[PDB]
């Protein structure tokens, strides 16, 4: 039992950490609960939360040196700079006191690491610096880690239209699925060749990428099921968000108890509160809903004054801010400037062509600190209060599923939603006033559902705006995720008239790939005719065909056909289809293109290429995939299974700049894993070596109303301290598709407690 002084804490508080590393906080005041959460989040994740803050405020170079200056400048270009009075009120009514209590608890732990250097996280010693003190405003001013779009897609679409000319619409059709499948129209007044992709992406990456430590510088699914369809008779609510994997993990599980507060679940460890989980009356989980929140604005600048741009027939001056960037090893801070138009920060300027480009990012406006709208539903007790809280949900765009212990279930999407009167938001626009956001939509303009006749709701990042609903015409967004996971889960959930918690856990682990099944179906139609017939004479081609013939499209870790297919579908087939459908230079820009759109061509190639050419492309690329699989196997006769290639290594940010012995302790190797980006058990990978990069780390399946029966997992662990056994103890549970209890009642928490922490006001 540890006992710590707690300056700023109002009343004594206790923390019971259970055997799986989940902290259970018991405070005597509402706001004391958030003090303890900040203290406990620092205890487990101080380096991580300090790193997020350092990156967000543009303070990296202060300790990491001159290579980080450009990233610090761009980070400050995308901090919230609006009115703070409005900002605090955007999230609910007491967000400022919550944030103030939280950072006081963080700062208490920081002070403790100065008093007791054995408590300082290893990474600080590894890099030669110390944790910083926090201010409440830091919590809401940092924005750039929020999931968002579509600045990058606008640049890519414009670049393709500039390069592909008359083939642009066909090439863009293969590059990116739109839903609904509208025809993009170049905005009047846009020259798509006046969009320098490399410079813009570089500036955008410097402004938004997570903290990175390169060698050079150092040399989702959710668903809710009504009780009439569950084995318990109570609702079941499940959620597994799909995000970057790493050690430590993106999210952290915790439990807050105080007078007026009883919430348990997950969130990013630097944010106060809980955004996925339940409060003993309602439960909630989320998946991305893609309202378009970024537009690239293109300006003409005055030749006599490059800091002025044309706006409504007048030269309008940019606002220029000066920032001081402290650099390790330099006595004076660097003085840098950042220019802003009336629409946002200038990412790039070209005085040769008298042009500038600014990011018009809705996430720089009030209320867009990611997930912090949960302030207003952590204490909601019914649907009216949950729907009300979602009225002010800012970022990221999300589908919320809802259930309560009275048996109700529901769905409401939310997020700051831009009105574009005269463009679709799919291309950059002239910034001279012809294209202006008309305001934001009220959330009651979006569809929603409450106790639907079906008795179940599934969302999985697909466009779920009903085509006959008025919102289908409002330009909410046209760029959604591949819909395979949604279709697969919708099939499974509708096909089970009675299902249990065990069944929902299994669905989160489902590895059937609808792209695989559809590709297999196309293969059965390949004609033994034209050049394809000769290719079927290749022993290597016939070897691959044999593997696929006896496969059901289940992307299992122990499956050799699955390995062949994932190699083929990611690195061979689609690039070959695109190259056979487009001129060479548009094909190079499109690459593997959009899986859904390429699948459509494979199934109906008529207007793209002769069916015989389709067949030839499939078998030629399949041969190359088989060659690669053999190349990657122990021998060409003992072939690698998918799991042999698809390694689940949770990588630490410093892995590439430390030695082998140190890397082995920072990284967490969980072995081989099944699945792909397109299976409900999402295990997206990088194409170089098929290693895991993204998917569900935190997973949750709740018995809504019998709370102690809830199940969760996280990975690789609850602790961010490599010397703590909770750093890596959850990864095997996750690797087996298993869970541990989400204990909630006082008796269950006591039964599960392994350590007690006592905080005393001082
Ligand atoms: Ca846009
Ligand atoms: Cl557009």
mmCIF file of C-alpha atoms in Angstrom, residues 526-718:
data_model
loop_
_atom_site.group_PDB
_atom_site.id
_atom_site.type_symbol
_atom_site.label_atom_id
_atom_site.label_comp_id
_atom_site.label_asym_id
_atom_site.label_seq_id
_atom_site.Cartn_x
_atom_site.Cartn_y
_atom_site.Cartn_z
ATOM 1 C CA UNK A 526 -11.485 -17.258 -65.088
ATOM 2 C CA UNK A 527 -11.583 -18.737 -68.579
ATOM 3 C CA UNK A 528 -9.117 -21.364 -69.772
ATOM 4 C CA UNK A 529 -8.754 -19.208 -72.884
ATOM 5 C CA UNK A 530 -6.471 -16.501 -74.265
ATOM 6 C CA UNK A 531 -3.114 -15.903 -72.582
ATOM 7 C CA UNK A 532 -4.628 -16.966 -69.251
ATOM 8 C CA UNK A 533 -4.898 -20.575 -70.488
ATOM 9 C CA UNK A 534 -1.121 -20.680 -70.973
ATOM 10 C CA UNK A 535 -0.554 -19.166 -67.510
ATOM 11 C CA UNK A 536 -2.636 -21.974 -65.983
ATOM 12 C CA UNK A 537 0.116 -24.198 -67.456
ATOM 13 C CA UNK A 538 2.694 -22.627 -65.159
ATOM 14 C CA UNK A 539 3.402 -25.029 -62.249
ATOM 15 C CA UNK A 540 3.767 -22.042 -59.897
ATOM 16 C CA UNK A 541 0.398 -20.632 -60.972
ATOM 17 C CA UNK A 542 -1.210 -24.056 -60.536
ATOM 18 C CA UNK A 543 0.356 -24.287 -57.068
ATOM 19 C CA UNK A 544 -1.260 -20.983 -56.049
ATOM 20 C CA UNK A 545 -4.611 -21.944 -57.587
ATOM 21 C CA UNK A 546 -4.552 -25.186 -55.583
ATOM 22 C CA UNK A 547 -3.972 -23.245 -52.361
ATOM 23 C CA UNK A 548 -6.902 -20.908 -53.080
ATOM 24 C CA UNK A 549 -9.245 -23.683 -54.293
ATOM 25 C CA UNK A 550 -9.562 -25.270 -50.859
ATOM 26 C CA UNK A 551 -9.898 -21.956 -49.006
ATOM 27 C CA UNK A 552 -13.016 -20.301 -47.515
ATOM 28 C CA UNK A 553 -11.608 -16.758 -47.237
ATOM 29 C CA UNK A 554 -11.046 -17.079 -43.464
ATOM 30 C CA UNK A 555 -7.799 -15.191 -42.884
ATOM 31 C CA UNK A 556 -6.529 -17.454 -40.084
ATOM 32 C CA UNK A 557 -3.066 -17.174 -38.549
ATOM 33 C CA UNK A 558 -2.482 -20.884 -39.240
ATOM 34 C CA UNK A 559 -3.608 -20.710 -42.902
ATOM 35 C CA UNK A 560 -1.207 -20.919 -45.848
ATOM 36 C CA UNK A 561 -3.880 -19.906 -48.415
ATOM 37 C CA UNK A 562 -4.504 -16.785 -46.312
ATOM 38 C CA UNK A 563 -0.815 -15.832 -46.543
ATOM 39 C CA UNK A 564 -0.853 -16.198 -50.333
ATOM 40 C CA UNK A 565 -4.023 -14.120 -50.585
ATOM 41 C CA UNK A 566 -2.829 -11.281 -48.350
ATOM 42 C CA UNK A 567 0.471 -11.078 -50.266
ATOM 43 C CA UNK A 568 -1.498 -11.058 -53.523
ATOM 44 C CA UNK A 569 -4.234 -8.623 -52.507
ATOM 45 C CA UNK A 570 -1.902 -6.054 -50.930
ATOM 46 C CA UNK A 571 1.251 -6.109 -53.080
ATOM 47 C CA UNK A 572 0.392 -7.642 -56.474
ATOM 48 C CA UNK A 573 -3.166 -8.030 -57.754
ATOM 49 C CA UNK A 574 -4.566 -4.513 -57.410
ATOM 50 C CA UNK A 575 -1.489 -2.717 -58.720
ATOM 51 C CA UNK A 576 -1.688 -5.035 -61.740
ATOM 52 C CA UNK A 577 -5.398 -4.388 -62.323
ATOM 53 C CA UNK A 578 -4.842 -0.622 -62.092
ATOM 54 C CA UNK A 579 -1.866 -0.796 -64.486
ATOM 55 C CA UNK A 580 -4.073 -2.710 -66.931
ATOM 56 C CA UNK A 581 -6.861 -0.096 -66.679
ATOM 57 C CA UNK A 582 -4.958 3.224 -66.777
ATOM 58 C CA UNK A 583 -2.120 4.871 -68.694
ATOM 59 C CA UNK A 584 1.206 4.192 -67.026
ATOM 60 C CA UNK A 585 1.598 7.520 -65.229
ATOM 61 C CA UNK A 586 -1.913 7.636 -63.758
ATOM 62 C CA UNK A 587 -1.421 3.997 -62.754
ATOM 63 C CA UNK A 588 1.737 4.931 -60.856
ATOM 64 C CA UNK A 589 -0.171 7.625 -58.969
ATOM 65 C CA UNK A 590 -3.071 5.302 -58.131
ATOM 66 C CA UNK A 591 -0.925 2.342 -57.039
ATOM 67 C CA UNK A 592 -3.111 -0.382 -55.550
ATOM 68 C CA UNK A 593 -6.042 2.046 -55.525
ATOM 69 C CA UNK A 594 -9.238 1.509 -53.591
ATOM 70 C CA UNK A 595 -9.956 -2.160 -52.776
ATOM 71 C CA UNK A 596 -13.738 -1.867 -53.219
ATOM 72 C CA UNK A 597 -13.403 -0.136 -56.592
ATOM 73 C CA UNK A 598 -10.763 -2.577 -57.870
ATOM 74 C CA UNK A 599 -12.949 -5.454 -56.695
ATOM 75 C CA UNK A 600 -15.778 -3.952 -58.759
ATOM 76 C CA UNK A 601 -13.646 -3.998 -61.922
ATOM 77 C CA UNK A 602 -12.578 -7.584 -61.278
ATOM 78 C CA UNK A 603 -16.236 -8.591 -61.015
ATOM 79 C CA UNK A 604 -17.345 -6.514 -64.052
ATOM 80 C CA UNK A 605 -14.332 -5.638 -66.221
ATOM 81 C CA UNK A 606 -16.317 -4.856 -69.386
ATOM 82 C CA UNK A 607 -15.738 -1.103 -69.721
ATOM 83 C CA UNK A 608 -12.184 -1.288 -68.299
ATOM 84 C CA UNK A 609 -10.505 -4.188 -70.105
ATOM 85 C CA UNK A 610 -11.407 -7.386 -71.977
ATOM 86 C CA UNK A 611 -12.359 -10.263 -69.696
ATOM 87 C CA UNK A 612 -9.348 -12.158 -71.088
ATOM 88 C CA UNK A 613 -7.030 -9.312 -70.045
ATOM 89 C CA UNK A 614 -8.626 -9.397 -66.582
ATOM 90 C CA UNK A 615 -7.829 -13.118 -66.360
ATOM 91 C CA UNK A 616 -4.261 -12.599 -67.582
ATOM 92 C CA UNK A 617 -3.668 -9.857 -65.007
ATOM 93 C CA UNK A 618 -4.992 -11.998 -62.157
ATOM 94 C CA UNK A 619 -2.812 -15.006 -62.967
ATOM 95 C CA UNK A 620 0.324 -12.994 -63.744
ATOM 96 C CA UNK A 621 0.088 -11.146 -60.437
ATOM 97 C CA UNK A 622 -0.857 -14.374 -58.624
ATOM 98 C CA UNK A 623 2.351 -15.981 -59.920
ATOM 99 C CA UNK A 624 4.374 -13.091 -58.520
ATOM 100 C CA UNK A 625 2.546 -13.460 -55.186
ATOM 101 C CA UNK A 626 3.317 -17.190 -55.097
ATOM 102 C CA UNK A 627 6.962 -16.454 -55.870
ATOM 103 C CA UNK A 628 7.047 -14.018 -52.946
ATOM 104 C CA UNK A 629 5.377 -16.486 -50.555
ATOM 105 C CA UNK A 630 7.923 -19.161 -51.481
ATOM 106 C CA UNK A 631 10.707 -16.579 -51.166
ATOM 107 C CA UNK A 632 9.454 -15.739 -47.651
ATOM 108 C CA UNK A 633 9.013 -19.361 -46.495
ATOM 109 C CA UNK A 634 11.541 -21.761 -44.904
ATOM 110 C CA UNK A 635 11.533 -23.637 -48.233
ATOM 111 C CA UNK A 636 9.272 -23.668 -51.326
ATOM 112 C CA UNK A 637 7.647 -26.890 -50.000
ATOM 113 C CA UNK A 638 7.064 -25.877 -46.324
ATOM 114 C CA UNK A 639 5.166 -22.646 -46.894
ATOM 115 C CA UNK A 640 4.673 -19.872 -44.364
ATOM 116 C CA UNK A 641 1.289 -19.546 -42.729
ATOM 117 C CA UNK A 642 -0.230 -16.085 -42.533
ATOM 118 C CA UNK A 643 0.674 -15.837 -38.849
ATOM 119 C CA UNK A 644 4.305 -16.678 -39.637
ATOM 120 C CA UNK A 645 4.439 -13.434 -41.646
ATOM 121 C CA UNK A 646 1.802 -11.314 -39.853
ATOM 122 C CA UNK A 647 3.757 -10.531 -36.694
ATOM 123 C CA UNK A 648 2.072 -8.690 -33.806
ATOM 124 C CA UNK A 649 5.006 -6.688 -32.439
ATOM 125 C CA UNK A 650 3.982 -3.674 -30.352
ATOM 126 C CA UNK A 651 6.670 -1.122 -31.175
ATOM 127 C CA UNK A 652 7.922 1.597 -28.775
ATOM 128 C CA UNK A 653 8.691 5.073 -30.198
ATOM 129 C CA UNK A 654 12.404 4.726 -29.346
ATOM 130 C CA UNK A 655 12.828 1.250 -30.887
ATOM 131 C CA UNK A 656 14.811 2.469 -33.877
ATOM 132 C CA UNK A 657 17.396 4.513 -31.929
ATOM 133 C CA UNK A 658 18.317 2.144 -29.058
ATOM 134 C CA UNK A 659 20.453 -1.013 -29.155
ATOM 135 C CA UNK A 660 19.142 -4.580 -29.473
ATOM 136 C CA UNK A 661 19.055 -5.366 -25.742
ATOM 137 C CA UNK A 662 17.164 -2.151 -24.976
ATOM 138 C CA UNK A 663 14.762 -2.591 -27.899
ATOM 139 C CA UNK A 664 13.881 -6.069 -26.691
ATOM 140 C CA UNK A 665 12.603 -4.586 -23.426
ATOM 141 C CA UNK A 666 10.737 -1.607 -24.994
ATOM 142 C CA UNK A 667 8.952 -3.667 -27.697
ATOM 143 C CA UNK A 668 6.345 -6.368 -26.995
ATOM 144 C CA UNK A 669 6.307 -9.415 -29.294
ATOM 145 C CA UNK A 670 2.934 -11.140 -29.111
ATOM 146 C CA UNK A 671 3.641 -13.629 -31.905
ATOM 147 C CA UNK A 672 1.678 -14.255 -35.062
ATOM 148 C CA UNK A 673 -1.891 -13.075 -35.569
ATOM 149 C CA UNK A 674 -4.664 -13.581 -38.122
ATOM 150 C CA UNK A 675 -6.891 -11.068 -39.876
ATOM 151 C CA UNK A 676 -6.388 -8.118 -42.228
ATOM 152 C CA UNK A 677 -7.584 -4.529 -42.615
ATOM 153 C CA UNK A 678 -10.856 -5.926 -43.991
ATOM 154 C CA UNK A 679 -11.799 -8.467 -41.282
ATOM 155 C CA UNK A 680 -13.858 -7.506 -38.190
ATOM 156 C CA UNK A 681 -10.792 -8.464 -36.181
ATOM 157 C CA UNK A 682 -8.878 -5.651 -37.872
ATOM 158 C CA UNK A 683 -5.103 -6.306 -37.988
ATOM 159 C CA UNK A 684 -3.961 -3.826 -40.656
ATOM 160 C CA UNK A 685 -0.322 -4.270 -41.643
ATOM 161 C CA UNK A 686 2.513 -2.535 -43.468
ATOM 162 C CA UNK A 687 3.222 -3.933 -46.908
ATOM 163 C CA UNK A 688 7.007 -4.268 -46.500
ATOM 164 C CA UNK A 689 6.896 -7.281 -44.162
ATOM 165 C CA UNK A 690 3.201 -7.763 -43.201
ATOM 166 C CA UNK A 691 3.820 -6.799 -39.568
ATOM 167 C CA UNK A 692 0.879 -5.462 -37.556
ATOM 168 C CA UNK A 693 0.387 -1.681 -37.520
ATOM 169 C CA UNK A 694 -3.242 -0.957 -36.568
ATOM 170 C CA UNK A 695 -6.456 -2.490 -35.266
ATOM 171 C CA UNK A 696 -8.247 -3.052 -31.984
ATOM 172 C CA UNK A 697 -6.029 -2.824 -28.919
ATOM 173 C CA UNK A 698 -8.768 -1.946 -26.454
ATOM 174 C CA UNK A 699 -11.882 -4.132 -26.930
ATOM 175 C CA UNK A 700 -15.064 -4.169 -24.842
ATOM 176 C CA UNK A 701 -18.243 -6.258 -24.600
ATOM 177 C CA UNK A 702 -20.678 -5.124 -21.919
ATOM 178 C CA UNK A 703 -23.588 -6.852 -20.193
ATOM 179 C CA UNK A 704 -25.616 -3.646 -19.902
ATOM 180 C CA UNK A 705 -27.075 -3.691 -16.375
ATOM 181 C CA UNK A 706 -25.217 -6.666 -14.862
ATOM 182 C CA UNK A 707 -22.052 -4.638 -14.943
ATOM 183 C CA UNK A 708 -19.566 -7.051 -13.341
ATOM 184 C CA UNK A 709 -20.092 -9.437 -16.293
ATOM 185 C CA UNK A 710 -18.473 -6.939 -18.663
ATOM 186 C CA UNK A 711 -15.337 -8.039 -20.501
ATOM 187 C CA UNK A 712 -12.410 -6.034 -21.874
ATOM 188 C CA UNK A 713 -8.866 -6.348 -23.133
ATOM 189 C CA UNK A 714 -6.071 -3.898 -23.824
ATOM 190 C CA UNK A 715 -2.658 -4.499 -25.306
ATOM 191 C CA UNK A 716 0.161 -4.753 -24.625
ATOM 192 C CA UNK A 717 -0.571 -3.607 -21.064
ATOM 193 C CA UNK A 718 -1.979 -1.008 -18.734
#
